[PDB]
Amino acid sequence: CHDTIDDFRNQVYSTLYSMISVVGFFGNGFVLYVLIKTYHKKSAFQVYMINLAVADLLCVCTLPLRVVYYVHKGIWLFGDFLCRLSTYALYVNLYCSIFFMTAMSFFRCIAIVFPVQNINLVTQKKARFVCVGIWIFVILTSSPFLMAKPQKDEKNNTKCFEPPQDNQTKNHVLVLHYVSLFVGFIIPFVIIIVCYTMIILTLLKKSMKSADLEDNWETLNDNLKVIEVKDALTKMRAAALDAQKATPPKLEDKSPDSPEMKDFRHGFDILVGQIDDAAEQLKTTRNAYIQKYLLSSHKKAIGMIMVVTAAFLVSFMPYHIQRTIHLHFLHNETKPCDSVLRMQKSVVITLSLAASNCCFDPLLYFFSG
Template structure:
């Protein structure tokens, strides 16, 4: 995700007099990626387990959520290597192959997540706005084909990231990874940025906005239908809020800042304070982009079909087992024979004792 990680000021002759943000970068990246790995792994593994257990009632939306969970898990699995890199203060010790694969895998899963969200939004759009057409188009078979197409498309479009491997920094004699090329390589980076900006972000985000506009318009014009089928409308609204939140917090700042940063690098009249501010904004937006893996479990919980029902049933099963166990233990501890006390003949007294026992 360090497509524009030009934050090592010691490596640039044009900014040699500017203060380095290496310490800030290493601390923020290592801490943020560690937290994202922990919360993202727990949330997506839990969601994936529940989604797999619900195989008997699969739907297109379920298929997209399953692939989104897998994509998020693969994304967070690449982050520990980055944590090691920044904990070692920018020294890469894992070899050229892992350097290339970790960069490639992170971008693949980042943009797969975006496209799976777009597919989920279009699935809801068909179900609400065109319910009759959805019976023919919104099938699980079609959803699986869409998911395969997304994986293949993103894997092919992300192949240029395999070209960026480790290299030796001549000034610090450190082995670097996740650092972009300079000079002529930077011009190729500009082209790659605009391709990913349009195809990886703008197009799916436009699809999402159009789908949500159609969903909201349909829900507002069918007030009586919403009252009869309120669950579908509520789930759609929840999905709209969560997906837009993820885009506005994670994906949009990253892509906007990345484009601004490229135009900023082409200028020669920048001051040191501007350069430091821009470099720190790179760090912050990259962390926000990686954090999308922690937000997606909210999508499973609040808008997934029967997801919360299965979670509630699991909680009731655990609670029911506890109650049954308690019910077996109470007669041993609380009976008159165990306590050596006579059974009260007065009905009111017996009810009072039962009440006190239950309160305990």
């Protein structure tokens, strides 16, 4: 037994931070470029996207300093201020990203679940105020990391990013860990679980209703081919009334009494009259009063669900489980080297995974933008 982790720590950190810095800087730099140079009006999603991009760039610009530290066999050479600023920067990026993803999911939920006054309840103006609130809250609550005591080794060398290794146990660090775990990870994660449950159930209801509208449109076209005659008519009439009751995907957000909805409902009314009269005359109505009405908002919601869920399971969750395990391990009487090694290797991996959160945000823009 010895400090066998020291070479592993410096090898894995140098590789992963170097990779996260390059992928993170170019990915979010590109996303920021594309969003800044926008001509069409900014969405609530775009407000959250710009803020995620900035929170990611703020942190990727500090990661090259972490790289220089581990390349130097754990010797800090930039002073106290830059050590406290590099530590603070990671926690600010991590908790800002958790809050922006939560706020984005919450907004998209109210948009999907409640399309009546959705465009007035979940506005770009509202997104801007929430983000400011998120920045102030995170910047203030994370400040103790800026006013922490400097770390020095046996040989009086300046250290940075040191974990409570062994017997460095404190009860109020454990109380701060729990408030942070609940407010900063468990409450945001529960809101996402609930919101995503509501979106998925809503998406099934709308997907099944659009299959019936696709089924009535299929029967109208099929019985038209059955003519080229009393049986085909009795079948098209029951379906044309059924299709009239259904709402098309194109006019899903608009009101039921809207003049856009009235036109589609009247189109089936003119077609029902032509059906009772009876083939090339009713084929004209289905190509002028109903062809236009018979969804992307559904694809952007699925894209968001997949990237954000992965970001929570892969990046945010292992760090928060490991921090709970680690802090309690310090309070335990017995500490063998075979357990202290596997604990320290996990700190290296779960922190690298937490820092890799900036790599998920360009993917959120491709799949949900």
